[PDB]
């Protein structure tokens, strides 16, 4: 199929997504109500564990056969 | 406890997967346990399935083979008997029409002629319902309002080989349509609707016309936004005098507004490449005409195999909709490479409409040999502004050498803007420079050189001539095709020309006119008639003559199939001239140094300054391709004709030789062509025979092109 | 400068001289929506206001826009009506 | 492309009996490949025949030469005729010969002239043979409608309806009359009885037994002619059971697991029939227990049997006539009367035997 | 293709081929093992291995179908987070293209269908299993994907500004402000709403957007 160094584990598709700029909220000036709170595309604030990018292990977990 | 494998044998007309699907409905599949007592049940179940095919005498056997670990292998053997045959179709109670002609429209057949396959004497209960509906439509649209089918019977011969079908009907009587009463909540538009519902006194009742009247009322309302109206006809029949009055209820709903128009499946084509073709736009009252016009324009674009529309209603809103266009990307563009006949020799070329989905049209090609070098670029932007104004250019560098040498390079620019939904105009500027040296003398070219003031010798190959021209390019285009790759209806026209502005070394003007017209015959547009032509003309302004290197050629796979490329038209006539460069062996006998005292005829095509081509082509479905991808192959029978003549040839001086100024010398050919849309772009194979042919023309019957 | 082809660009809410006269002060949002239809354009920045704009750009001829704006109180009752004919 | 499965071979045997053919009079085009019930009828010293078209002829029974001919075809063009699709069995009575049609017509031609005494329409294809006895004519049509007609006028007197399943055998059972009542079989598998005066029901019963899960698995109809003797009626069905039913009550006496479309003979305590597999068997009237069975003509598509000189006679699709004897169940002799074959029952009376071929020719055998 | 054998040998061969990197042959072996013995202990591990091999072999539709099967067969399983992450990653990998990736084309304004599907799946993963080791990468992918969907919205708004359709521009920017409030595309698209409001003579409404722009400027 292929022959490369440690291509068994790492993701396919580079690492472009790690360079995306961070998100910042808009400030609502005096005397107005911004509509921003009305969305469902919310990203929760999470301190979860894990690695990022090519350092992740995609190999399937081993069932206790 | 488990079935290790399953195998079918003997099935011919049934795909094994269908049998497996039937088998699993009984609860048996790979991995499931099997019971030997139920083997007969499986056999009977499979047996009962073939009744759908009409093979009522078929039989099936099931074999179970033990396998290690208590596994079993199941093998099914099928004896597919002959299907039942329709012996007769009988219609009882019909008094107004011949039973033969009523059956003539039936999908089912009781007789099949030898001279044509109009159908098969096979039976399928699915077709019987459609056939009954066809009978009802035939009887109900002739004025027989009271027509109804009492009952039907399907019978089977005791030997299970024959089918008999009987249909009982009651005709009633013919009725006259006294008038139409359209009423309800029209929301205005009474003027249009009253005109759609026009009837003539004494007109016979006609169900299909009533359906058309309802559909037209629906379409008229959908044009103004009411794209969910309620229309219902309720005829009131009067058997006392046999007049029928057609009451029609109309209730336009709420005017709808477009919330969003969304595109799906454009995985590579930029989004704005699709929106700029739309005529319906967001935040505006809906119109069905515009939504369909968007589909038509996207189809004409030619980037997509299939374009489909949808108008899903917005949940929780009474008067809003969303419009979804689902497209299937097509592999636009072309590629073609090769190697020379006989050191390094190679040709190349790439064409791309929709280059990387950006909508640009880019093309590159070239070739390098020892003889010649050639290169060209082309870039076009269909929307240089939002309205549709396009801007494009072109460069090319040509360098041919035998001795006879010809270097040529130039430039071009064109700006084309629309004038109407289908029409378009163009304008531009061009520059061309030609350097010719050591051309071997001949009449057709020395005449032109004399017109330009050059006076080269007729007996030597050592004269040269260099020129430089600026031109003004115009044009026009009409396009109403259905699609961009395999059209099926509509026509196209494309006029192109140019003229040299003052200051150019040579003065002339040139015109061409390509045409194409498709006329469908079948309702599904599988059988189509293609009419195609080309034309041309050019001449010099003032005392100037049209340059010989802008001449018209015909003959290849593009103009008139069957003849060698660019072999039609006048043939050169060589003067008796010296071998100033060299006298090779087994070549260069045409008016060469040794012998050949007088002017020598030849077969070297040179083209002419006028052309006329035509073609009539018939298109049929491919015999052995499923409809799943029958839209990537096209088969065609064609009859092509063409000619080329040199309007300035003077037969008075060159009387001993043919009069090339005669248009009557028409060529012709016929054959068959196959066209396939391979990953490398379209591929065309064609076999033709030039059954009309003139002295000097070269025949080439098999031709393959990209 | 010269220009030679452009499509018809219809934008907004389709108003007429009949419906615009039906509405009157004191009507709830339901009645106004029933009469004129759902507005394509409303005030997002914290205020009950409905914009009924009726744009028409018929090619190179010109442009016309009737602007009818309705302001309701917190309870959804129409308190003010202001319709402004063409630009 | 795929061929039929089964067909036994012509069984070699010596012709200890001495039959012979005669006549071979060509009536006309013949029934051809269509399935119908156009058997000849014999009365006095003349015979009558039909031709799956308007053609009708009356032939002298001593020579096979015609005495009068008639055509019932109808014009449909300048030089074209619409076929009469004549498919009803010929039966005769005083001065009338009654015929059916698939065009829904019923004819009654004068015996001495062939001129139409009367003609009327019925409730669909009159496929069954008309039967007349001490009253009205009776006809059984494809719609399941049983209709009675005035023998001298053709006007309908009364009608009875019977159910019709989705798919049924091509044919209709002729009615049988007894003590003023008429007993018939339907396509649903029932055996019904009615009175002649106004078609009032007397009793109904079921004899079909398949009760399958699909139409052809359910394909079980009483297409045979029921027969009555000594107050009991026998009935048979395609896949059903040979049974005996009490005439007065309709309760069943005994069943036997046999099924066929061909009618059966009755004589003494013996009943002979032809199975759907073309096997030939003889059974007792008491309980139907087998007497003997002849099982070598498998899948030859025999015709219905007749009783002639104590010997059963049957045809086949290959034009042979097979003679069976009650003494041992053996074959006494064989002929090749016709080339095209037989798909219509033979007839015999007054020591005279005859049969009509599939091509329209009529043969007499002695 | 695959000789008949007890499941253990087939699974051993499949694992050996996966370790060697032969995706096609491993897929064949695992498919055979799954079809032949869907009841045995290997019914789960073979599903996971098939998902992984399909994804690596670029047979994304089959990987998606296998994930759909597994989620229904075992809606509660210790390693579901892995399958959810792989569903999201499959939908993401179904978005990119190679050629226009090499030529440096900005693919933001093409079809966003797969991006939305991947966002939904990653959001399910992160909200359901915050302790899983895939949550961090899921969050990074989500942060990128939200800004790949706001860019498409801005791309549509730009066109409807060019064609002079003002109600469409206003509605599109309102949708951006309601769905993707904090992205950069929403800050770029905001001045398009003000121009649209001013082209329709509704200046009193354009001043509010002007205030929003001023209050958040660099």
Residue numbers in the entry:
A (entry chain C): 25 to 89
B (entry chain A): 92 to 433, 437 to 496, 503 to 806
C (entry chain E): 24 to 110
D (entry chain B): 26 to 391
E (entry chain D): 26 to 243
Can you list sentences taken from the study reporting this PDB entry?
The β‐barrel assembly machinery (BAM complex) is essential for outer membrane protein (OMP) folding in Gram‐negative bacteria, and represents a promising antimicrobial target. BAM is thought to exist in two major conformations, defined by closing (lateral‐closed) or opening (lateral‐open) of a membrane‐facing gate in the core component BamA, itself an OMP. Transitioning between lateral open and closed states is proposed to be essential for BAM function, with multiple antimicrobials shown to bias the conformational equilibrium in vitro. In X‐ray and cryoEM structures, opening of BAM's lateral‐gate leads to an outward swinging motion of the six N‐terminal β‐strands of the barrel relative to the ten C‐terminal strands and their connecting loops.
